[PDB]
UniProtKB/Swiss-Prot annotation, chains A, B, C, D, E, F, G:
Other notes: The configuration of the closed gate contains an opening large enough to allow rapid entry of tetrapeptides but able to impede the entry of proteins and longer peptides.
Effect ascribed to mutating residue 70 to A: Prevents PAN to associate with the proteasome and stimulate gate opening
Protein name (record): Proteasome subunit alpha
Known outcome of mutating residue 86 to D/G: Prevents PAN to stimulate gate opening
UniProt cross-references to PROSITE patterns, sorted A to Z: PROTEASOME_ALPHA_1, PROTEASOME_ALPHA_2
Consequence when changing residue 86 to A: No effect on PAN's ability to stimulate gate opening
Amino acid sequence: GAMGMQQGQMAGGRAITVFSPDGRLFQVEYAREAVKKGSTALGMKFANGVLLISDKKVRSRLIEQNSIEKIQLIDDYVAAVTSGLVADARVLVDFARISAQQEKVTYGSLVNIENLVKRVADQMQQYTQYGGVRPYGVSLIFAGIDQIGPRLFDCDPAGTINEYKATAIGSGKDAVVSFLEREYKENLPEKEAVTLGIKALKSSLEEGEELKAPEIASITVGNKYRIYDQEEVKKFL
Amino acid sequence: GAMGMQQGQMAGGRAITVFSPDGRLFQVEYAREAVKKGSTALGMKFANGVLLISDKKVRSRLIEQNSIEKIQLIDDYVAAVTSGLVADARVLVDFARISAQQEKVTYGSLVNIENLVKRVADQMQQYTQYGGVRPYGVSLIFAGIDQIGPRLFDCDPAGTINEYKATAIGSGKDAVVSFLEREYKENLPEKEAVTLGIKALKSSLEEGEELKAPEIASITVGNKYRIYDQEEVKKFL
Amino acid sequence: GAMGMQQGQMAGGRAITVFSPDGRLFQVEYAREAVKKGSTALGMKFANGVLLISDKKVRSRLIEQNSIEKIQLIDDYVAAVTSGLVADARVLVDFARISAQQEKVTYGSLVNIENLVKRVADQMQQYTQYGGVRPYGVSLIFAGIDQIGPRLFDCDPAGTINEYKATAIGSGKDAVVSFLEREYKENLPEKEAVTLGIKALKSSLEEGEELKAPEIASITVGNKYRIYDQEEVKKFL
Amino acid sequence: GAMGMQQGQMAGGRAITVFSPDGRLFQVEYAREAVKKGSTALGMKFANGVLLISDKKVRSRLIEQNSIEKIQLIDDYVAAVTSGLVADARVLVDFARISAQQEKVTYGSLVNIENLVKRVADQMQQYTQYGGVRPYGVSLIFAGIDQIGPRLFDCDPAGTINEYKATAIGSGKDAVVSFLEREYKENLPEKEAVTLGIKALKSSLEEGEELKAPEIASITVGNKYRIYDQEEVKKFL
Amino acid sequence: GAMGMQQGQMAGGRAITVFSPDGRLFQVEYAREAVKKGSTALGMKFANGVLLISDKKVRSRLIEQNSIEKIQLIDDYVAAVTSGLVADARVLVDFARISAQQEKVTYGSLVNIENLVKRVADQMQQYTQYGGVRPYGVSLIFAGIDQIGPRLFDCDPAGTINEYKATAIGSGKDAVVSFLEREYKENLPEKEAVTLGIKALKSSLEEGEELKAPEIASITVGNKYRIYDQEEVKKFL
Amino acid sequence: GAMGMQQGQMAGGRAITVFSPDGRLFQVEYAREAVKKGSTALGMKFANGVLLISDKKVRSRLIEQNSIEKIQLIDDYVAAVTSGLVADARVLVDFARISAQQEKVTYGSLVNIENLVKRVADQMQQYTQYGGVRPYGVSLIFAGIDQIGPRLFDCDPAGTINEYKATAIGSGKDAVVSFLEREYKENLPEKEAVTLGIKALKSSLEEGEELKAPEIASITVGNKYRIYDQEEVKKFL
Amino acid sequence: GAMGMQQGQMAGGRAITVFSPDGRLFQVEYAREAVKKGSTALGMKFANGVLLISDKKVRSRLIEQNSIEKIQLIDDYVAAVTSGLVADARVLVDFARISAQQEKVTYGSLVNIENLVKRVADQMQQYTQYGGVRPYGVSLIFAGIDQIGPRLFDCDPAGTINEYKATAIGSGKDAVVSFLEREYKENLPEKEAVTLGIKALKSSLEEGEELKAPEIASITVGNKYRIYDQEEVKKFL
């Protein structure tokens, strides 16, 4: 290792690394498609915290209900929800989990969450140009409260990242996003915030009437994340 | 020890890791095909345990009967049954076996079985994107009782994993699954559960009348797995 | 039938690791072809041991007769006979050989022969999915007596393995396999076993009348393998 | 990880690395296209410093405003602004950052900024010829005051670097560059410099009337970088 | 409907490691061709040793005669001759040479010559399946006396190996092999053996009348190899 | 069939390491094209030293004049001028620089400059054959005075190196090279030498009349390099 | 988008390391072409030494005459002359130089010059089969006197080597070779040898009348190489 490269490379790889004559990475585009075909979910900053809410659409009676958690915990103060290729999504989450621990064990504290999202984004970005390897077909949004305050970030297959006041992803994005874009209330207290949200989620994917059972979680500055119990969400439902 | 692989070109070339214009991994699809053409098997949680049952369809008098065991043990408290390219299934089984052992030797106990399946799933997910290498053409289900209790999982070539109350896989999946979807009884005591199962298995693949000799095994909270003997199974047959 | 390629640069150069739209590994298929064109051989469990018998079809006077041994020992208590690409068989056999030694030197004894074959099988299966490399176009059968008793297994290019009561391989497989399928006698004593065998072998490939000189070996529980001498085989001939 | 590996054979991969019969790297060309489609930004030396300004074109009310910072600090005395594939840009920037620190910890001080940009450019140049890997689709400009005095450089996907008296990049380059090319005033005092710039920016992208909210930062010999606050910028707006 | 793009036939990839739809390695085939276009040579066991003979076909006066030795020594007790791509032949010959020394240095003696050839063969076999690398376009025959007694083997591009009573290689293989196949005399004493040989060689390649000057060497049990001198060979000519 | 060959017309390239049926490296050729489209520059040995001169064609007022140095120093007693892909030139130049230092640190002195060029030349030659990598799209000339005396060398993308009495490179190579070819005066004294040069340079590229501001430098045995100041050059201009 | 004499499908050898259906390496073939298009040179053993002679065809007056040495030394007792891709030739020569030093440093003396050439040949041969790498487009001849005596060898891109009494290489090979093939005099004393040579070289390439200035060097057993001075050769001219 005379060169002493910071990043190792198992192989150069072949395919997935061609700009179209119009300056676009088609594979990254196709990857985005798969995410469009995923479940719908959203999140939004409110009073003194941020909430995450995803549409838990279930099929057979034979499915073990809750076990199909869409909103996941990275750490007591940071959760993420994903949409797209399930396998890809999982693996990406675990990366984020350990990555979170890493900052914790070295600095002793996850001071800025933006940094956590950046690291998993970069992971994704590498597959955007490193030849022989398929891009991660998934998008996800991170939410929680860090040293700075309540934070909401999203991230696409491209490795692109932005911070929002409110946003959604998955199948009914354009829809639910418009709703918020119009009726999103800045410092909405929790109860009302979850309402506006569920209403927004509803309107969107609710071309098929029944909202079914939404999965919702919320954290407020000062303490740990709170997952809503079946009845509590059904109350807003 | 170690293989000592100084330098070799095991992986190379281009032909996979390409998302289609509609967001699909055709290779993983083609793989799924291989599993459909696999034998039929199912399982379900019951009273205070879970059972597994596979259709042991035999040909020649010259085959060594039982030696063609479809339900395989991972450890005294967890078994799995597979469907798809036989070779791929075997190697993927052994991986889970040692992987199981690993958790035992570090932590002292395989507390959560869900985790065991996740590892093997991730293994499969890797070949879903790492360029030069064909995916695992197989699906399988893990069943057993862990720290949490009786648990039932299934996994496909995509690395997708889900927990069930009852399910099937292989050739007659759609069929048998629908029967259960309809006549599945929550806390059915073992004797009746194995029955409902065998009945369900019958209907499905039984376009060809004869059920032949099914392979069935079960475990109940509090103890190790029990493989049904020829006569015992023939009793429900 | 293109999926949706538009890049002029891409149009070929596909590697070995592609499932057909129907879920098949054509390469493994074409491999099988090669083994079909191989010599014909069989083996069957009998009284208290198992035997091996292959058709040693010779051409020129100029060949060093016996030197063209088709039945090869892996160890005094276990042998294998092969068919398909000669070179690939050889190297595969030597692998089994050393592999056998390993278990002996670590555990002190090759307790279960089934395991030895599983390993060489796994070797083959690796080439079925690891990109840049050609599958082993050879099928072979191992037989001998282990701690469990007299055993017989076969292995094809896909790495598939099974245990039989009797079986064959090579060109005249279908034929000879059918003969046994019908006239195979369970605990047939050696002398008669070899008879039924040579008879079966005959019928099959004997579209060309002359059986020529078969190569036959047998081992019985309690002792080491015995290779039949020219005269002894000719006796049954 | 657990197994040791030796780095060797620099060559690897095969894809982009072909000169057209007219001696052009089409890939790098396409890359450039991507940068044309990016946001517009510029920079210019003035009285005793240099300033940067980028068009921060915002969409939804749901975006976290400022968080979409386009001008980025590399260190208190040198900033950079980018255009092209957003992910690529980010990773490149961080490289610039760690690299800047590297010089500082070895030499004790980043004496010549030209060097910094030289290293990042070489980074990009590598992807212009090393087989299997897609080029960075981005162009950025570095500005800041070094040991030599105020300095301004630009960098394109080809690895080409040049020092300007003023320049721009992104979508409206041609437009804005021309305006300056004509009315650029040599040692224009900051206040008028930023004016000449925002005007130049306006005219250009201002086919769509509304200049929206520009992002502007400036540094002067002797001290650290200063970013203009919302009101201050709005003052020149 | 149903998919039927590939009924059973598939396109052959350019890469080296593809079985044809008929179970054949075309590249290995093409290699064989190269060997047929080589010079003709043969060898045969006789009285109490073995001899080798190759047609040394010379062109210009400007060639350094003898220097074009086709019969090469691997060790005083074992020689080999080759046909096909000259370069490939040479490299292949030296490997065998060093390989022989290795056996000598570890065991203290080259006990069985069959093993030596086996090693050189496996080498070639490797290039039959390991992807990116062209097979050895050469075939050679080893001859000499070992612990067992006089021995003779041949080896082709496929790594296939056999031992003969007599055999040839190169261009006029088919012709000369037939001659011997018919007129080969078992325990023919040297003088006559070399005659039968030279006659056989003659007949074969002697469509062009002049046999020219043949290269011949012979070893007998009990001693080292003996290469015939110009005059001695001309005596049988 | 046999000796099958595709269309003679070549357009869509792929791998880089393929001789044409006529014995040429199309990629290296195409490379040359890139250099032809580069600036024009020349050099010639004179009285007791050597001088270099390049046409510094400038565009916008906004460029930082001198900073676009075309003549670059490798060490106080050796400089080089380059033409072709700017990016490839630079990286190559730096290679020569450190390469120079290397000889100094080991032998204590850069005795022979011809050697320095050979090393940078080999670097280039390497990319002419090592597969997966695009050749350096540049040519340059090295001149200065070494232990032997005043020297002048040129190097193209192929890695070809020649020593000249006078030569040129770039766009108008053929033209200027011809003027010299005819009016070159062997031991011309500096002042006149630079005159003959500028004249020669003029004629060539001067289809467009204005010579603009040339960049010139000269060194004489016994001392270090001297770069002409704006006015000085303007004097000959 | 491919190169070929247009005759049938199948690439001639673009993917390198591919035997043609008739058993030929097209890439190696194309390489030979380039050596044909190189300068013409020859050598022949004489009285008690050997001499080399190459046609030094020069163009412009601007070239540094002698500096374009075609005959190069490897060591005071062995020289070689090359033809083909100049760049490839050079690196190939340096290899043989260091390679010579190696033997001297280990054994204390270069005993057999044949070995030296063989090493440079094998190097070449490697690129004949190791996939991703263009073969060396050059041929060269080594001449000198070793422990055995005066020696002369030639070597092509294929890695084929032969020892001669006299031979040539490059463009007019066939021509000059015939001349020798007819009028070559065995133990011709130097003065006359060089004559027979220069005459031969003349006839050949001299379709263009003027032989220009030939480069000639010779060595005699017992002492070191002697390169002829401009006048001395002009004496034979």
